[PDB]
Design a protein around this ligand. Structure first.
Ligand SMILES: CC(C)CCC[C@@H](C)[C@H]1CC[C@H]2[C@@H]3CC=C4C[C@@H](O)CC[C@]4(C)[C@H]3CC[C@]12C
Ligand SMILES: CC(C)CCC[C@@H](C)[C@H]1CC[C@H]2[C@@H]3CC=C4C[C@@H](O)CC[C@]4(C)[C@H]3CC[C@]12C
Ligand SMILES: CC(C)CCC[C@@H](C)[C@H]1CC[C@H]2[C@@H]3CC=C4C[C@@H](O)CC[C@]4(C)[C@H]3CC[C@]12C
Ligand SMILES: CC(C)CCC[C@@H](C)[C@H]1CC[C@H]2[C@@H]3CC=C4C[C@@H](O)CC[C@]4(C)[C@H]3CC[C@]12C
Ligand SMILES: CC(C)CCC[C@@H](C)[C@H]1CC[C@H]2[C@@H]3CC=C4C[C@@H](O)CC[C@]4(C)[C@H]3CC[C@]12C
Ligand SMILES: CC(C)CCC[C@@H](C)[C@H]1CC[C@H]2[C@@H]3CC=C4C[C@@H](O)CC[C@]4(C)[C@H]3CC[C@]12C
Lengths: 555, 150, 49
């Protein structure tokens, strides 16, 4: 099996769990998990304490072990067991939340001693319990944390106007849960406030970058604005490096290699560094300007990923990531048909300007623009050009008036050229585009439901990252960086984690035990009243009656 | 008519996405080619209005492509310029990376005219299918209200 | 060897789908029907008492 070999390896030596385990209800539950006893594990879960945390840890362990499984059948049985465990856990969470909102909330940040002292939310994230994160109660809890001490029902415009006007913090509006200093710190440390500050700083960066790029980018040495922008990007790269190192130096680097927009942020910073280098070296001024221009696009694209936490745009931003396969299919099909038509017309009409760039233009770029309304009808049709003997080859030419359409085209089969243009217009502007619309519709309908579920977990992740993010804005985050360096330097001479009371621990334990036993009784009653179970009960009643009547036939 | 009120969220998403992509492409092209007419209204025009009209068939190809303009030393900066014939395209454009400008125009045409518009069509279809049934039910009560008011 | 293996798996599949058919609700209902009618008959054989 997959148990004895791992036990022997551990003896000869998730990993910390294996180190801790060696050859009350929790031990039985974990033994059933490792032995993959589905019914035993379910019984131990329903009989044990801290049911939600135990179920989350069980799902995590089953997912990890199934990923480590070499055999497909065992992997499948383990993963469906994990799915059912997650289902019963989320049902328990819902029935607990439906009674006591505050008690259910305080259940989460409880530090359960089992499963390596991991918070329930961390267990769900490591297990990728997207169904658990999709639960309305945890969604509301994460919303409250993102609006930490900020009256989560407050309107957005009130929050933003308070952001531009700090003095309006002490007003009848903008409620919350040294009073002045505590209010200041609580308002400026809220994750939503940090998000707003970062957003306004990023828009200021975009405006500054555009202003430096368009106007103040002479070959002269950089001015005050360009130096300020260099310092700006230094602060941004310091922030990103700190975030990557915080969220095993080589092990964390490989993890940071994933999360591909962290990758796009990194490639953006590297492109900016190359741009600054090329700008500073005298020879590469133009190349530096070009790469900076592309870097602006990369930064603006990253703005989209940063601004995805909005509750009405995030699902669609997740969708547009799923449209890439469709647009790639359209691009390939259009490329094939475009090569066809472009080379065919470039052969049928024979411009004397047979230069390679001009050929690559007339074959690809011009037919591409024919799709979006730019049809050089007077450049490719014989009737629209004036006839002239612009070539010595024995034919009729009719030199066109276009600048890059060739100085002297041919006209032998220009009726076929016109018909071929008609066919291209039918294929590209009618077939391909409308087919792409249809397949976008189909794929959108298929993927939107799963995208919302994914966006729940992605939003939780973003809330966690902004919570871990320091308070100061990128313009002033250098102060926070120096503070962090001092905290590492002052150590040489020498996530939420809301505290719960000791007796409150036992109180919530009893509460969740009562609710879990009520839920078990409810599902038992439901299955008993199920029609199939009623049918089997009637069957056993009737054949029991037949058996008992068989004992009086001798009369 | 009740439905078209429910399309505002969808069109707002499309507007925001197009705004982001439009800012990116417009500033990129406005930096890649360097018109001498660096006036603020002209910049705000060439970055937003012109790329917006590129969506609906108004493509200033002869204004942004180097091959379509005549070459001239319209500026004293050490480069090749080829002053365009456009009225508001800049009196003296640059041409160093105009191949990249052309490729960037191609990418913008692919993104806006193909991806964004068709995606918006798809999401209109989905939302219409979702909301038409509830809209009819709402319209019954709204019609009763209008009858009462009249 | 493979002949024996596939024979074992095919007989397992026969047994599995036979059990599924037996546990089907309609088949359970019909079985209860031939239990009830048999009970009615066997009481019909003792009505003379
Ligand atoms: C969100 C971003 C992309 C918006 C881009 C708009 C940019 C191009 C605008 C915003 C501020 C504007 C600058 C403001 C004022 C002047 C005065 C004068 O010197 C002409 C141009 C110049 C220097 C503008 C350049 C263009 C500018 C930088
Ligand atoms: C303009 C250049 C950089 C092309 C890439 C731009 C866009 C398409 C890139 C930049 C950041 C990228 C996203 C990075 C992270 C995620 C989260 C993942 O779970 C789904 C894909 C998704 C949502 C990517 C989608 C594609 C993305 C938005
Ligand atoms: C579908 C793909 C493989 C088609 C390949 C592109 C073909 C159709 C076209 C596009 C650019 C064209 C080249 C343009 C310029 C020249 C230089 C000329 O002195 C000889 C022909 C030659 C070498 C052309 C060959 C054909 C060419 C490569
Ligand atoms: C995305 C696919 C389907 C479209 C085909 C790609 C086309 C548009 C690309 C591939 C090679 C590119 C060309 C590269 C070189 C030149 C020469 C330059 O003086 C004008 C632009 C022009 C002509 C580019 C235009 C764009 C181009 C033709
Ligand atoms: C140029 C500007 C002023 C055009 C304004 C158009 C706006 C005001 C129109 C277009 C669609 C219209 C809506 C049609 C349907 C509804 C749903 C109803 O339950 C409340 C009114 C409301 C919401 C209408 C309000 C007015 C409305 C939103
Ligand atoms: C709705 C979003 C996505 C599109 C972007 C809005 C654009 C179209 C708006 C914002 C600022 C506006 C510009 C305001 C000022 C001028 C200067 C004037 O002499 C010509 C029009 C022009 C250039 C406007 C054009 C339209 C404009 C550029």
């Amino acid at each position: 099996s997959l148990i004895r070999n791992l036990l022997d390896q551990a003896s000869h030596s998730v990993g910390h769990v294996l180190r801790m385990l060696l050859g009350p209800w929790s031990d039985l539950l974990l033994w059933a998990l490792l032995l993959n006893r589905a019914q035993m594990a379910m019984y131990f879960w329903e009989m044990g304490s801290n049911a939600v945390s135990s179920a989350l840890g069980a799902c995590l362990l089953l997912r990890v072990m199934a990923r480590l499984e070499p055999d497909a059948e065992e992997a499948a049985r383990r993963k469906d067991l994990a799915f059912k465990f997650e289902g019963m856990g989320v049902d328990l969470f819902g029935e607990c939340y439906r009674s006591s909102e505050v008690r259910a909330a305080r259940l989460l940040l409880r530090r359960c001693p089992l499963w390596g002292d991991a918070t329930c939310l961390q267990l769900a994230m490591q297990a990728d319990a997207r169904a658990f994160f999709a639960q309305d109660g945890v969604q509301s809890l994460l919303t409250q944390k993102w609006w930490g001490d900020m009256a989560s029902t407050t309107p957005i415009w009130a929050l933003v106007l308070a952001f531009f006007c700090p003095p309006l913090i002490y007003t009848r509006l903008i409620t919350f849960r040294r009073r002045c200093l505590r209010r200041w710190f609580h308002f400026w440390g809220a994750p939503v406030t940090i998000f707003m500050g970062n957003v306004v700083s990023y828009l200021l960066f975009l405006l500054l970058f555009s202003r430096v790029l368009l106007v103040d980018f002479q070959p002269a040495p950089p001015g005050s604005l360009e130096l300020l922008l260099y310092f700006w990007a230094f602060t941004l790269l310091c922030e990103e490096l700190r975030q990557g190192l915080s969220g095993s130096l080589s092990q964390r680097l490989r993890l940071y290699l994933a999360d591909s927009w962290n990758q796009c942020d990194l490639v953006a910073l590297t492109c900016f560094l190359l741009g600054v280098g090329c700008r500073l070296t005298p020879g590469l001024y133009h190349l530096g300007r070009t790469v900076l221009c592309i870097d602006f696009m990369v930064f603006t694209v990253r703005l989209l990923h940063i601004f995805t936490v909005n509750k009405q745009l995030g699902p669609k931003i997740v969708i547009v990531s799923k449209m890439m396969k469709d647009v790639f299919f359209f691009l390939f099909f259009l490329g094939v048909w475009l090569v066809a038509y472009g080379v065919a017309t470039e052969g049928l009409l024979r411009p004397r300007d047979s230069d390679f760039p001009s050929i690559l233009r007339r074959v690809f770029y011009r037919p591409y623009l024919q799709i979006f309304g730019q049809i050089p009808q007077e450049d490719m049709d014989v009737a629209l050009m004036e006839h002239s003997n612009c070539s010595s080859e024995p034919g009729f030419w009719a030199h066109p008036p276009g600048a890059q359409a060739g100085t002297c085209v041919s006209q032998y089969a220009n009726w076929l050229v016109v018909l071929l243009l008609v066919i291209f217009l039918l294929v590209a502007n009618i077939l391909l585009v409308n087919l792409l619309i249809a397949m976008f519709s189909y794929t959108f309908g298929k993927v939107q439901g799963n995208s919302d579920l994914y966006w729940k977990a992605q939003r939780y992740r973003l809330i966690r990252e902004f919570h871990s993010r320091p308070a100061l804005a990128p313009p002033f985050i250098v102060i926070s960086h120096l503070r962090l360096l001092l905290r590492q330097l002052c150590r040489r001479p020498r996530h939420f984690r809301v505290y719960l009371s000791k007796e409150a621990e036992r109180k919530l334990l009893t509460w969740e035990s009562v609710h879990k036993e009520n839920f078990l009784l409810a599902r038992a009653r439901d299955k008993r009243e199920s029609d199939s179970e009623r049918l089997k009960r009637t069957s056993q009643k009737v054949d029991l009656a037949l058996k008992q009547l068989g004992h009086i036939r001798e009369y």
